[PDB]
């Protein structure tokens, strides 16, 4: 074990030296020529009311109109964001839902949490109401995130420090991703859905290739638990929010932190991050009940989406980039433009 | 407009369903149940997946306890799910080299957690009979895990249990005073600690919770009126 520890230390030094050689400058020192976005006077256009407890999670539709939101009162509610109409209301067997996903085809939703189970609910039922279509059991830690790759293949992250890729039809784990030592709090599928980055409570964000299930890279630099992660829209970069009150954009192809978004008065942990459709704005939900829109290239705070009465727990940017949806522990989901 | 009418009909049905569900949700008090395995927490669960929901009721009042089993001992993330619960029933394993000090540290972490700073904590010193057996036999040797117990004295407000040895009373009230030292330090009335002396098979365990829950609710109302 001592020999393995020494080898691991030497490999860590080699990786650190390789990252240092590949990075003599940060994102800001290269993006001096890009135009600052100025103050983003983003404003609330809709407020989705009807959740009783703290929305712990929400997910948009691919149509960018319907969105699924999860409240820890035990509710999975689909909102027609345009007309603020609830499309479906799904009671949950486990009230403690910590994650929800909306299938890209829109036929299905997923939710999970302290039950460890990823419940897949079918929307387009012949019976006329949402039923428990499938249950994915097999995680031994709380289910912190879940994302559909398609109608049948879904990737989930759990508190058991492992991620699991499931075939929904059979209900069996197609692949198990392991290597995190902290509670894996979130994951994000790449635009090609071939790669996915998951941040854990070990201050490290691990990128996995879904097909074979190996941890391709382990980006480090965060000081505390990573609670939020999302790919940059090109799929060649991602961002993480951590309890250290700093967001960090990492390159996949540079294996290290590209930029850090932080401010001295910000001493609260980012709870949710999401890029705008172009990736110029990184929206991050903070515990101070506010969301900060960071100009992801100049790293300055472009705007503040103040208005939430409690901790911002989730964000989602529409696939067409028209609107943001921010949920919060105040039981309310504000749509912003 | 026909599609909008159908959508509005479905939305109104959903809204009336949610209004119906809100009555049940508000009438039911979510309670977190926390503690180590040796604390007798599962015994209290029996007396009353990665979470074990227990719906029970006192005087036609619904409590929904959540015994968090099948979860990693790294509590710092899923614990945040329980900020809005009525109370956290923290059961301690009094009688890990020093399990009691670990319980004290966990209670301190809960008390000073920025999300649980508004969440009340009921406290159960579960192993009172076993603590008595170990103190009277000299096997607990709490005095070495806590040197200040060599100078601690039974407080004037202490009410001994019927037939309880003075050493047992001194030990239990020392434990309570340690936990109240943690709680009162930076308590600030935003949340309240309710220590109790209980056995594993005590049927009072529900009432001591229920009353405290009532108290918590009452105090919350007063905090809403700026009366406290």
């Amino acid at each position: 074990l001592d020999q393995l520890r020494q080898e691991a230390e030497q490999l860590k030094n080699q990786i650190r030296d390789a990252r240092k050689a590949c990075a003599d400058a940060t994102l800001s020192q290269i993006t001096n020529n890009i135009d600052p976005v100025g103050r983003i006077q983003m404003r609330t256009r809709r407020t989705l009311r009807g959740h009783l407890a703290k929305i712990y999670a929400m997910h948009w539709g691919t149509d960018s109109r319907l969105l699924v939101s999860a409240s820890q009162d035990g509710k999975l509610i689909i909102w027609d964001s345009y007309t603020t109409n609830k499309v479906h209301a799904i009671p949950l067997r486990s009230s403690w839902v910590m994650t929800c996903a909306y299938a890209p085809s829109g036929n299905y939703v997923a939710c999970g949490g302290l039950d460890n189970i990823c419940s897949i609910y079918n929307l387009k039922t012949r019976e006329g109401n949402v039923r428990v279509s499938r249950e994915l059991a097999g995680h031994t830690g709380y289910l912190s995130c879940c994302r559909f790759l398609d109608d049948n293949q879904i990737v989930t992250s759990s508190g058991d420090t492992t991620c699991a890729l499931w075939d929904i039809e059979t209900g069996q784990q197609t692949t198990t991703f392991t290597g995190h030592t902290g509670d894996v709090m979130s994951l994000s599928l790449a635009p090609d859905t071939r790669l996915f980055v998951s941040g854990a409570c070990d201050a490290s964000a691990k990128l996995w290739d879904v097909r074979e299930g190996m941890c391709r890279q382990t980006f480090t630099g965060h000081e505390s638990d990573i609670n939020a992660i999302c790919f940059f829209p090109n799929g060649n970069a991602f961002a993480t929010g951590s309890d250290d009150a700093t967001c960090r954009l990492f390159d996949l192809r540079a294996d290290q932190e590209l930029m850090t978004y932080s401010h001295d008065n910000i001493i609260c942990g980012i709870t949710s991050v999401s890029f705008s459709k172009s990736g110029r704005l990184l929206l991050a939900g903070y515990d101070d009940f506010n969301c900060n829109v960071w100009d992801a290239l100049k790293a300055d705070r472009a705007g503040v989406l103040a208005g939430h009465d409690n901790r911002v727990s989730c964000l989602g940017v529409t696939d067409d980039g028209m609107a943001v949806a921010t949920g919060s522990w105040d039981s309310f989901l504000k749509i912003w433009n | 407009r026909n599609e909008e009418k159908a959508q509005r009909e479905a939305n109104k049905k959903i809204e009336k369903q949610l209004q119906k569900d809100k009555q049940v949700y508000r009438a039911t008090h979510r309670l977190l149940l926390l503690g180590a395995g040796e604390s007798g927490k599962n015994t209290i669960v029996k007396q009353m997946s990665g979470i074990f929901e227990t719906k029970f009721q006192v005087d036609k009042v619904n409590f929904h306890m959540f015994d968090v089993g099948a979860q990693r001992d790294e509590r710092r993330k899923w614990i945040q799910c329980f900020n809005d619960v009525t109370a956290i029933i923290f059961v301690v394993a009094s009688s890990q080299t020093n399990r009691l000090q670990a319980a004290l540290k966990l209670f301190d972490s809960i008390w000073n957690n920025k999300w649980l700073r508004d969440t009340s904590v009921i406290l159960f010193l579960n192993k009172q009979d076993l603590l008595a057996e170990k103190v009277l036999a000299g096997k607990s040797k709490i005095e070495d895990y806590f040197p200040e117990f060599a100078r601690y004295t039974t407080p004037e407000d202490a009410t001994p249990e019927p037939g309880e040895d003075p050493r047992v009373t001194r030990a239990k009230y020392f434990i309570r005073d340690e936990f109240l030292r943690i709680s009162t330090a930076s308590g600030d009335g935003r949340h309240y600690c309710y220590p109790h002396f209980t056995c594993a098979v005590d049927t009072e365990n529900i009432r001591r919770v229920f009353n405290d829950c009532r108290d918590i609710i009452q105090r919350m109302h007063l905090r809403q009126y700026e009366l406290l």
Partner: nanobody
Amino acid sequence: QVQLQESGGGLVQPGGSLRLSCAASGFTFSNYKMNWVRQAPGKGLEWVSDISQSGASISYTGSVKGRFTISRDNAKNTLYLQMNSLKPEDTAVYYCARCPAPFTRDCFDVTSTTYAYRGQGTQVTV
């Protein structure tokens, strides 16, 4: 990467003295409350002592009250445990455990089996 390296542990005769030094790296040491915990042979990770962000607040487990002094040098980004009057039951692997979140008074999970922000541990045999 959050790294905590303990050093200075070693063989000490009973009733002797020793000094455990924790070198911290990969994080702003001043912002984090720090802890010493110990894994005794055949026992779970007992928590030994903790010190606040600035060092103004200090607490010990009972068995080391007065015996050991915890301290932190924020300038050198390091933590110290000056150990005195060592009894044989102090023989353990000492882990320098950082609290998870900065600026927070709570210190969840430092005694957990696989806590992340914890050092490799230094052996102290008495």
